[PDB]
A paper describes a structure:
In this paper we have used site-directed mutagenesis data together with the elucidation of the cocrystal structure of a TolB box containing peptide consisting of the N-terminal 107 residues of ColA (TA1–107) bound to TolB to show that the TolB box of ColA consists of a 12-residue domain that binds to the β-propeller canyon of TolB. The structure was refined to 2.6 Å resolution; and the model has excellent geometry with no Ramachandran outliers. Even though 107 amino acids of the translocation domain of ColA were included in the crystallization, only residues 9–20 could be resolved in the electron density maps. Our final colicin model fitted the density very well, with clean difference maps. TolB, as previously described, is composed of an α/β domain at the N terminus and a six-bladed β-propeller domain at the C terminus with a tunnel through the centre of the β-propeller. Refinement of two small, independent peaks of positive density using water, monovalent and divalent cations suggested that one Ca2+ ion is present in the central channel of the β-propeller and a Na+ ion is present at the interface between the N-terminal α/β domain and β-propeller domain. Our structure of the complex of TolB and TA1–107 has revealed that the TolB box in ColA is a 12-residue peptide with the sequence of 9-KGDGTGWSSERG-20. The TolB box core of ColA forms an O ring shape, due to the hydrogen bond between the D11 and the E18 residues, and sits at the bottom of the tunnel in TolB with six hydrogen bonds stabilizing the interaction with TolB. The first set of interactions are predominantly hydrophobic in nature, with only one hydrogen bond between W15 of ColA and D307 of TolB.
Colicins are plasmid-encoded, protein antibiotics that consist of three domains; an N-terminal translocation (T) domain, a central receptor-binding (R) domain and a C-terminal cytotoxic domain. To facilitate import of their cytotoxic domains to their cellular site of action, group A colicins, such as the E colicins and colicin A (ColA), use the tol-dependent translocation system that consists of the TolQ, TolR, TolA, TolB and Pal proteins, and constitutes a transmembrane protein translocation portal or translocon. TolB is a periplasmic protein, whose crystal structure was independently determined by two groups, and is associated with the outer membrane via an interaction of its C-terminal β-propeller domain with the peptidoglycan-associated lipoprotein (Pal), and with TolA via its N-terminal domain. ColA interacts with TolB through a TolB box (DGTGW), that has been localized to residues 11–15 in the T domain of ColA and shares high sequence homology with part of the TolB box of other group A colicins such as ColE9 (DGSGW).
Residue numbers in the entry:
A (entry chain A): 32 to 430
B (entry chain B): 9 to 20
The structure:
């Protein structure tokens, strides 16, 4: 129902006025974001302990809380900062340190230091790899006239955004390479649609495909050797795969129907995609070495835009169920579907590399904004807003 | 500017 109760104490700050960042706020919000933890409200804390020994287990047990996060933040002549946390047991081992660490970071990595604490605590208590130091990429339509579309990247939680690319035409569907160093996207900069790959550090741009008609929807294979995308030069959209070492392209689908929005399975062999071949969009699957695709979505009237988990256990998608469209999960072994979001005009979902969260676009006014839903359905939140309309969120791999 | 499906993430 609500996530496992946990106490996050405001981190101890030694110095000038107020701390430069609320490290324990970051740690609380992250843990809340995963759906897994219900951090006790800061106002409701029984004690603001500043280290592992200043923690009173009784106080915490009494509230159903078996772990407390405390930390410290100190400054360094060098303009840098020391950030430390201790995860203390208040359950079976009252007063025991379960995890702890120490960083030296510049002010600009304070959020990062909070996210490292989050990741470490998260993983110790759940045994699941933390995803709080991973980013998202998306397209923003701004109010600027000349370059209204802006391929951007930020931290999964909205902070620290930067611009990768500005365009006078539209940009669509960004995709991360599995090492997180490149993004693939559709650009219309030419007058026509084209698929490029951009190195983030560099800005270097590799041209991938520009055939007649349509070129879109990229997905990098998990092993890093391929790029799947859709092309409609035959007459309808069909799936193609490119060998990145050679530049060589295969046709994966043939079909008078439209086949688009490829997504990989963990084996870099199979893809799930969307096809209208059955009328209203449905999710299908196919091997890149051929064979016929198989439908895999029988729940609801329409299912499109899939994202398969990194372990291949499930998939998220845009689904029309009970007469409307939301983000929903399909257990790939059992077959069950769960509706996750409850906002309006839910599009483009993307999974976090540990499968605990989904980022998606939703409709608000004449504009788009970004939403985050835990994969268990418990936690829903809108991200900080920005200066224009936001579409096409892509969650990065671990970084 | 789109893929000309009317259904996809990439229509317009
Ligand atoms: Ca997609
Ligand atoms: Na952040």
């Amino acid at each position: 129902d609500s996530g496992r109760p946990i106490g996050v104490v405001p981190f101890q700050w030694a110095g000038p006025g107020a701390a430069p960042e609320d490290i324990g706020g970051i740690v609380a919000a992250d843990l809340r974001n995963s759906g897994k933890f219900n951090p006790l409200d800061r106002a409701r804390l029984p004690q603001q302990p500043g280290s592992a020994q200043e923690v009173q287990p009784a106080a915490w047990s009494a509230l159903g809380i078996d772990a407390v996060v405390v930390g410290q933040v100190t400054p360094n002549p060098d303009g840098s900062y020391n950030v430390a946390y201790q995860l203390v047991d208040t359950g079976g081992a009252p007063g025991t340190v379960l995890a702890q660490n120490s960083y030296k970071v510049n002010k600009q990595w304070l959020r990062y230091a909070g996210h490292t604490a989050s990741d470490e605590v998260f993983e110790k208590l759940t045994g699941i790899k933390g995803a709080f130091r991973t980013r998202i990429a998306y397209v923003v339509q701004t109010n600027g006239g000349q370059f209204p579309y802006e391929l951007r990247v930020s931290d999964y939680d909205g902070y620290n955004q930067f611009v990768v690319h500005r365009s006078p035409q539209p940009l669509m569907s960004p995709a991360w390479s599995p090492d997180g160093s490149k993004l693939a996207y559709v650009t219309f900069e030419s007058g026509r649609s084209a698929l490029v790959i951009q190195t983030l550090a560099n800005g270097a741009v590799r041209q991938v495909a520009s055939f007649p008609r349509h070129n879109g929807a990229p997905a990098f294979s998990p092993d890093g050797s391929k790029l799947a995308f859709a092309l409609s030069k035959t007459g309808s959209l069909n799936l193609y795969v490119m060998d990145l070492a050679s530049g060589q392209i295969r046709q994966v689908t043939d079909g008078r129907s439209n086949n688009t929005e490829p997504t990989w399975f963990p084996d870099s062999q199979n893809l799930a995609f969307t096809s209208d071949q059955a009328g209203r969009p449905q999710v299908y699957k196919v091997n890149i070495n051929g064979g016929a695709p198989q439908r895999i979505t029988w729940e609801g009237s329409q299912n499109q835009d899939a994202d398969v988990s990194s372990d291949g256990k499930f998939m998220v998608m845009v689904s029309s169920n009970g007469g409307q469209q939301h983000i929903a999960k399909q257990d790939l072994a059992t077959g069950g579907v769960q509706v996750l979001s409850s906002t309006f005009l839910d599009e483009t979902p993307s999974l976090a590399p540990n499968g605990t969260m989904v980022i998606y676009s939703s409709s608000q006014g004449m504009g788009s904004v970004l939403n985050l839903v835990s994969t268990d359905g418990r936690f829903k939140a809108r991200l900080p807003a920005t200066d224009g309309q936001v579409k096409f969120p892509a969650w990065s791999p671990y970084l | 500017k789109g893929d000309g499906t009317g259904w996809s993430s990439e229509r317009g």
